[PDB]
Amino acid sequence: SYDTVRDKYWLSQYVIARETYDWYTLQKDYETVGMLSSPSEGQSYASQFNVRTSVTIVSIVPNGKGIGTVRFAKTTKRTNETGDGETTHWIATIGYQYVNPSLMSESARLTNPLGFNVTSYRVDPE
Amino acid sequence: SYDTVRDKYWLSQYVIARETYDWYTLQKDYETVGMLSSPSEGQSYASQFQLDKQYGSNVRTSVTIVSIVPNGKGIGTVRFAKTTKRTNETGDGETTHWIATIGYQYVNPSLMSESARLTNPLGFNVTSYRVDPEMG
Amino acid sequence: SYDTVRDKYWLSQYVIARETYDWYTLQKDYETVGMLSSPSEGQSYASQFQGDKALDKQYGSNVRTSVTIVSIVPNGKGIGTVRFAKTTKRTGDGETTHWIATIGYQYVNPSLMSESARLTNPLGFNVTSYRVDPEMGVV
Amino acid sequence: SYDTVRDKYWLSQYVIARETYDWYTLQKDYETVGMLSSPSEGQSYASQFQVRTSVTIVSIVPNGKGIGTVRFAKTTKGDGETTHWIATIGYQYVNPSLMSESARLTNPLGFNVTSYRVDPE
Ligand SMILES: [Cl-]
Ligand SMILES: [Cl-]
Numbered sequence: 093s094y095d096t097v098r099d100k101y102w103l104s105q106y107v108i109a110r111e112t113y114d115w116y117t118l119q120k121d122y123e124t125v126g127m128l129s130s131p132s133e134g135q136s137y138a139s140q141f142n143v144r145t146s147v148t149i150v151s152i153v154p155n156g157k158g159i160g161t162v163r164f165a166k167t168t169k170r171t172n173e174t175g176d177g178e179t180t181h182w183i184a185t186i187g188y189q190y191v192n193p194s195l196m197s198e199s200a201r202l203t204n205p206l207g208f209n210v211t212s213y214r215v216d217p218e
Numbered sequence: 219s220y221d222t223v224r225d226k227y228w229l230s231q232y233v234i235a236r237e238t239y240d241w242y243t244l245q246k247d248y249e250t251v252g253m254l255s256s257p258s259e260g261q262s263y264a265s266q267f268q269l270d271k272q273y274g275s276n277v278r279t280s281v282t283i284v285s286i287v288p289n290g291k292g293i294g295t296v297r298f299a300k301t302t303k304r305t306n307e308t309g310d311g312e313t314t315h316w317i318a319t320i321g322y323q324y325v326n327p328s329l330m331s332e333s334a335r336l337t338n339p340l341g342f343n344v345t346s347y348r349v350d351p352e353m354g
Numbered sequence: 355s356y357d358t359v360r361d362k363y364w365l366s367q368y369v370i371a372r373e374t375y376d377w378y379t380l381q382k383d384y385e386t387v388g389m390l391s392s393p394s395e396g397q398s399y400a401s402q403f404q405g406d407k408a409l410d411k412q413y414g415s416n417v418r419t420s421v422t423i424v425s426i427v428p429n430g431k432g433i434g435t436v437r438f439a440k441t442t443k444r445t446g447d448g449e450t451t452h453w454i455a456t457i458g459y460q461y462v463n464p465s466l467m468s469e470s471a472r473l474t475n476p477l478g479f480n481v482t483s484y485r486v487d488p489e490m491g492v493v
Numbered sequence: 494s495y496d497t498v499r500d501k502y503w504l505s506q507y508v509i510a511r512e513t514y515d516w517y518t519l520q521k522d523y524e525t526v527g528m529l530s531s532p533s534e535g536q537s538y539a540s541q542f543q544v545r546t547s548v549t550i551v552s553i554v555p556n557g558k559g560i561g562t563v564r565f566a567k568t569t570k571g572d573g574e575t576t577h578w579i580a581t582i583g584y585q586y587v588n589p590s591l592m593s594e595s596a597r598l599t600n601p602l603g604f605n606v607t608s609y610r611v612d613p614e
Contacts, residue, residue, distance in 0.1 A: 094366055094423040095257040101363035104356060132556050149356045153268045155533050156261025159583075159608060187560075187583050187608060202473035205386075212560060212583055214610065262533065293590055317593040328450030329422045329439050332491055348532050350593035351524065 099188070100152045102128070102208040103160045107184050110137070110213070111166055113145040127200040130189075130209045137213075142171045150181075158211075160186045163218065181218035187211040225288040225322070228254070228342040233296045233318050234281050236263055236347065241275035253334040256345045278305050284315070294320045297352065314351075321346035361428040361459075364390070364479040369436045369455050372399055372484070375419035380410065389471040392482045416444055424452070432460050437489060451488075458483030500584070501553040503529070503604040504561045508580050511538070511609070512567055514546035528596040531607045538609075545570050551577075559585050559607075564614065576613070583608035 109124040122141075126134045150163040162184040169177030193207035201207075235250040251263045284297040296318040303311030327341035371386040387399045402409050422439040429435055436455040442448050464478035510525040523542065527535045546569045555561040563580040589603040597603075 093257040093260060094426075096261050097359070097362045097366060097426065100359045104359055130558065132558065132560070149359075151268075152359070153265050154261055155265050156258040157531065157533060157607070159533070185608075199473070202470055205382075205474060211558070212581070212608065289590070295593070317595075319590075319592055321588075321591050326441070326447045326450065328447065329441065331424050331437075332452075332489075346587075346591045348592055350528065350596045353593070353595040 096154055096156070098206065099154045099160060102206070103152050103154070103162050103184075103186055103188070104149045106186070106208075106210055106213075107149060107162050107164055108147050111145070111147045111164065111182075111184075111215070113143060113168075115142055115144075124203060127196070127203045128208055128210060129213075130211045133210050133212060144169050144171050158187055158189055160184075160188065162186060183216050183218055185212075185214045185216070187213075222288060224340065225294060226286045228340075229286050229288070229294045229296050229318075229320055229322070230283045232320065232322075232342075232344055232347075233283065233298055237279070237281045237298065237300055237316075237318075237349075239269075239273060239277060239279040239302075241270070241273075241278075244270060250337070253330070253338050254342055254344055255347075256343060259344050259347055262347070276305050278303055292321060292323050294322060296320065317350050317352055319346075319348045319350065320344055358428060360477065360479075361434060362426045364477075365426050365428065365434045365436050365455075365457055365459070366423050368457065368459075368479075368481055368484075369423065369438055370421050373419070373421045373438070373440055373453075373455075373486075375409070375413065375417060375442075377410070377413075377415045377418070386474070389467065389475050390479055390481055391484075392480060395481050395484055398484070418443060418445060433458055454487045454489055456483075456485045456487070457481055497555060497557075499602065500555045500561060503602070504553050504555065504563055504582055504584065505550045507582065507604075507606055507609075508550065508563050508565050509548045512546070512548050512565070512578075512580075512611070514544060514569075516545075525599060528592070528599045529604055529606055531605045534606050534608060549575075559583055579612050579614050581608075581610045581612070582606055 106125070106128050109121045109128065112121055114121070125137055129137055145166050145168045148165040148167070150165060152160060152162050154160040164184065165179050165181050167176050167179045188208065188210050191207040191209050193201045193205060196204070196207065231250070232254055235247045235254070238247050248264070248267065252260050255263065279300055279302045282299045282301065284299060286294065286296050288294040297315070298318065299313050299315050301311050301313040303309065322342065322344045325341040325343045327335055327339055330338065367386070368390050371383045371390070374383050384400070384403065388396050391399065419440055419442045422441065424437040424439060427435045434457045436457065437452065438455065439450050439452050441450045459479060459481050462478040462480045464472050464476055467475065507526070507529050510522050510529065513522055526538055530538055546567050549566040549568065551564040551566060553561060553563050561582045561584060563582060565580065566575050566577050568575045584604060584606050587603040587605050589597045589601060592600070592603065
């Protein structure tokens with residue numbers, strides 16, 4: 093369905109924003125994560141604060157009631173090695189809902205026009 | 219009355235589709251749940267198959283509807299048994315009893331796809347579905 | 355895969371923005387079509403709210419056309435098909451018709467947009483052809 | 494607030510029901526967890542379900558928006574072994590008519606846990 097397509101896109105965007113490490117996009121990624129997170133999950137993410145980690149989304153299963161499961165890989169390279177480096181696999185378990193986009197900043201609403209908000213997020217090894 | 223007959227038919231069709239596991243009806247059962255559900259309930263059902271490659275065609279769970287009570291104001295209660303047999307075997311398998319409580323309405327049927335509107339021209343639509351064990 | 359998810363998201367967002375007529379979301383819809391479209395396609399949409407013909411002048415606040423997305427199939431080679439319903443009523447159920455949008459699309463360099471556009475569309479989704487035909491079923 | 498008093502009570506009841514091990518009450522406890530759980534969380538609990546362990550609630554902090562943190566101890570049985578834990582619990586309230594009559598007698602306010610995770614302290 094369309095609501096599923098929607099949720100799968102934003103769950104995927106969230107994991108990419110939150111799990112990537114890229115020096116030159118990190119301020120932008122950090123900001124994106126706050127704009128897609130509820131106030132308390134945003135406060136909780138802020139409290140966890142050259143290599144490059146890239147994310148591959150493998151699959152996403154929303155339960156249709158505000159939990160989603162995202163299987164994904166992270167590939168961490170020392171920038172100044174040749175290959176793609178070490179790849180590990182993970183499962184994000186993500187609570188989320190949609191808020192009134194008027195109830196956020198104007199900038200937040202441009203980044204997050206549907207008002208998608210992660211309310212909880214946990215990552216476990218696959 | 220006619221609303222009661224209509225509602226009782228659909229509640230039972232919903233429980234049968236949603237609670238049956240049979241490899242040879244599965245595609246049809248799966249599509250019926252989709253046509254008859256809100257997107258959230260649809261996805262709630264469908265997400266358990268995103269179970270069939272766990273069970274394949276070795277397990278069959280069939281439903282027996284025991285009573286159907288529409289409770290007024292778009293809620294209905296369906297008592298039913300589910301019976302699971304490994305597909306090899308004669309024997310009765312294991313039977314458990316359940317109560318599905320079901321929030322439902324009739325939506326604009328024009329919004330649905332072609333095939334959905336043939337099967338569900340009245341727009342039966344489940345917005346909440348919950349199964350609890352049978353007690354008193 | 356992820357590309358399918360991305361494509362299907364943007365294809366539907368496009369059809370919702372472009373086919374919806376709702377006074378209270380019109381300014382946002384209009385702007386979203388602009389961000390997601392080629393100059394041609396953008397002006398093709400925008401042109402219907404210009405001159406004395408402007409659709410909003412001739413509807414105002416008294417008509418609402420809402421969209422239900424029914425299926426989205428990316429067809430490969432940057433073409434996608436969105437089946438959808440449009441439901442119009444003046445402010446019962448109003449009038450529902452079914453439609454097929456065929457959409458040529460690509461991902462362009464996202465720096466070429468105003469920074470507003472790049473916040474909303476950082477991947478650079480860009481529609482270069484848009485056509486709606488009536489639903490006929492299959493055969 | 495009252496909403497907080499309410500949430501602390503049901504969150505504490507949930508952890509008591511879900512983390513206690515008592516042979517003579519295990520079936521009632523199992524049933525209680527189902528009646529206090531969303532449909533999906535009830536399915537998930539039932540799958541993962543496979544001495545006497547008693548629960549002591551130490552504190553309950555709801556965030557006011559559907560997440561609660563419960564710090565608690567489990568004591569298995571002189572004294573026995575006590576370990577310490579943190580349940581992170583998502584929850585909401587649903588219309589009590591959307592559940593069975595029996596469910597609704599155990600859970601009159603329609604409290605539903607939508608997610609549950611326990612971590613060591
Ligand atoms: Cl959004
Ligand atoms: Cl984008």
